[PDB]
Design an enzyme around this catalytic site. Structure first.
Site, PDB file in Angstrom:
ATOM      1  NE  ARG B   8      -3.543   2.360   2.657  1.00  0.00           N
ATOM      2  CZ  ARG B   8      -4.504   2.518   3.559  1.00  0.00           C
ATOM      3  NH1 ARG B   8      -4.741   1.629   4.493  1.00  0.00           N
ATOM      4  NH2 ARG B   8      -5.220   3.650   3.471  1.00  0.00           N
ATOM      5  CG  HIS B   9      -0.377   5.015  -1.663  1.00  0.00           C
ATOM      6  ND1 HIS B   9      -0.672   6.016  -0.766  1.00  0.00           N
ATOM      7  CD2 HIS B   9      -1.527   4.724  -2.296  1.00  0.00           C
ATOM      8  CE1 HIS B   9      -1.975   6.299  -0.872  1.00  0.00           C
ATOM      9  NE2 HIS B   9      -2.516   5.538  -1.810  1.00  0.00           N
ATOM     10  N   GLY B  10       2.256   5.046   0.966  1.00  0.00           N
ATOM     11  CA  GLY B  10       2.265   5.816   2.187  1.00  0.00           C
ATOM     12  C   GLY B  10       1.602   7.161   2.084  1.00  0.00           C
ATOM     13  CD  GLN B  13       0.587  18.094   1.647  1.00  0.00           C
ATOM     14  OE1 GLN B  13       1.721  17.607   1.767  1.00  0.00           O
ATOM     15  NE2 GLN B  13      -0.033  18.869   2.548  1.00  0.00           N
ATOM     16  NE  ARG B  60      -3.734   8.053  -3.356  1.00  0.00           N
ATOM     17  CZ  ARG B  60      -4.790   8.418  -4.088  1.00  0.00           C
ATOM     18  NH1 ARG B  60      -4.646   9.252  -5.123  1.00  0.00           N
ATOM     19  NH2 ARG B  60      -5.998   7.905  -3.790  1.00  0.00           N
ATOM     20  CD  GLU B  87      -8.289   4.196  -2.037  1.00  0.00           C
ATOM     21  OE1 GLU B  87      -8.992   3.155  -2.079  1.00  0.00           O
ATOM     22  OE2 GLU B  87      -7.352   4.403  -1.215  1.00  0.00           O
ATOM     23  CE1 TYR B  90     -15.260   8.136   0.995  1.00  0.00           C
ATOM     24  CE2 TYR B  90     -12.869   8.041   0.824  1.00  0.00           C
ATOM     25  CZ  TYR B  90     -14.025   7.796   1.518  1.00  0.00           C
ATOM     26  OH  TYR B  90     -13.983   7.219   2.784  1.00  0.00           O
ATOM     27  CE  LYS B  98     -10.677  10.708   4.481  1.00  0.00           C
ATOM     28  NZ  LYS B  98      -9.856   9.475   4.641  1.00  0.00           N
ATOM     29  CG  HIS B 182      -4.614   3.296  -4.438  1.00  0.00           C
ATOM     30  ND1 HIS B 182      -4.079   4.549  -4.263  1.00  0.00           N
ATOM     31  CD2 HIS B 182      -4.448   2.986  -5.750  1.00  0.00           C
ATOM     32  CE1 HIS B 182      -3.559   4.982  -5.450  1.00  0.00           C
ATOM     33  NE2 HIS B 182      -3.773   4.023  -6.372  1.00  0.00           N
ATOM     34  CG  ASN B 184     -11.011   1.737   0.478  1.00  0.00           C
ATOM     35  OD1 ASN B 184     -11.161   1.097   1.539  1.00  0.00           O
ATOM     36  ND2 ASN B 184     -11.073   3.063   0.431  1.00  0.00           N
TER      37      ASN B 184
END
Ligand SMILES: [Cl-]
Lengths: 239, 239
Positions: B8-10, B13, B60, B87, B90, B98, B182, B184
């Site tokens: 999974r990427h870190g 930003q 990313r 990902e 959304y 959030k 990603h 999800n």
């Protein structure tokens, strides 16, 4: 009119050490990273974007392409990495210092090893640590494809079929292509596209980090080619 | 026994700004670049190398893969970049904060938008600037493939066929695969490989920047899976 963009990578650490490089997989210096980023920003500003990218399996070219794609916001682009776009293989000269070599064997002999059209550098043996057969990225190559040495002539023999078998068909399909590669694999390709003689290609050195744009007609005959960037800086770099 | 590695990427930003990200193409922070490099160095030290890599079309993840490949000295590896590993989309929440969203609409409502298995975030319209149809990297997608919103359920509907149609056949052919993706899209894949229920996957969060290794038997049934790295650091990150 279809456009093709070529970019030669910039300074490697072995260019700073003045060493024959060939297939040795040396990285870019900080200066060669900056050249890649400048070329990508210039391409963006001049309105270029792409559908597909080709490069070699040597990281100084791959990293040039990655930096260019980041400046274009096209890191998502499909990429093909092929050994057939690798730099000319320098045989047993790989890793030696060019000035020390010219001192020990003579200036004229080094001029022939570097630029005689079909002159081959002294050969490796297959047991040498530098033989490409030991490196996992060439696992699929045949003995005949694994080089002990290459001249420009032998480089041409492997770059032009890849152009004809793979890259040009993709361009004919309407895709905008970028190639990030090396001094002598791009001299090979430019010799072919520009119908140059042996005597003409002897003099040609493609400037590093400079987009070279080809325009092709409806029959994919080259119509014109030009550099992007500051003309005085580019012409100096080409010397 | 065949091995698969997931990463999974870190930090991005927008993770630092606490924003719903989805298909918005935000870059890694310096911290997320460091996580990618640490994961690649750890893979090298634990003796892993690869034959092929998959990632998404979001930078990313792509940049995570590029940094991992550099630490492995495998920048030459063949790479496929697919929107099907993106990902979860959304919807209209993309770009919102959030915590501000939880304040305005309620904590429970945000919990449902984030994690109800088949609950969809509020939808975009096709005229919104954020509709994927406007972005050149999705040129080949159909209306039906361009998302207005996605739940985990809808993410599963696109990640698992890609696994079955494309990635798993390549593994069966004997190639060692790495996937950089990603939160999800990897929860989707792990739900499937681990035969998890809706209630079970609700709790699972894959830690960022941590190699997750799957072992597969001769019939490509998963036999075991484990994390590489410092156990206390990883388990904390998974919370
Ligand atoms: Cl790539």
């Amino acid at each position: 009119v279809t456009k093709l963009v070529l970019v030669r990578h910039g300074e490697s650490q072995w260019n700073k050490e003045n060493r024959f490089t060939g297939w040795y997989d040396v990285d870019l210096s900080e200066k060669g990273v900056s050249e890649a980023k400048a070329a990508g920003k210039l391409l963006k500003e001049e309105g270029y974007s792409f559908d597909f990218a080709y490069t070699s399996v040597l990281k100084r070219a791959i990293h040039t392409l990655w930096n260019v794609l980041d400046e274009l916001d096209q890191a998502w682009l499909p990429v093909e990495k092929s050994w057939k776009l690798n730099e000319r293989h320098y045989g047993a000269l790989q890793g030696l210092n060019k000035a020390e070599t010219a001192e020990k064997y003579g200036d004229e002999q080094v001029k022939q090893w570097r630029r005689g059209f079909a002159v081959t550098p002294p050969e490796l043996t297959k047991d040498d640590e530098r033989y490409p057969g030991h490196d996992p990225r060439y696992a699929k190559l045949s003995e005949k494809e694994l080089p002990l040495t290459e001249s420009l002539a032998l480089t041409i023999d492997r770059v032009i079929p890849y152009w004809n078998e793979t890259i040009l068909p993709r361009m004919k399909s309407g895709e905008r292509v970028i190639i990030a590669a090396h001094g002598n694999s791009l001299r090979a390709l430019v010799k072919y596209l520009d119908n140059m003689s042996e005597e003409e290609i002897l003099e040609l050195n493609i400037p590093t980090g400079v987009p070279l744009v080809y325009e092709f007609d409806e029959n994919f005959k080259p119509l014109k080619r030009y550099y992007l960037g500051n003309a005085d800086e580019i012409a100096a770099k080409a010397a």
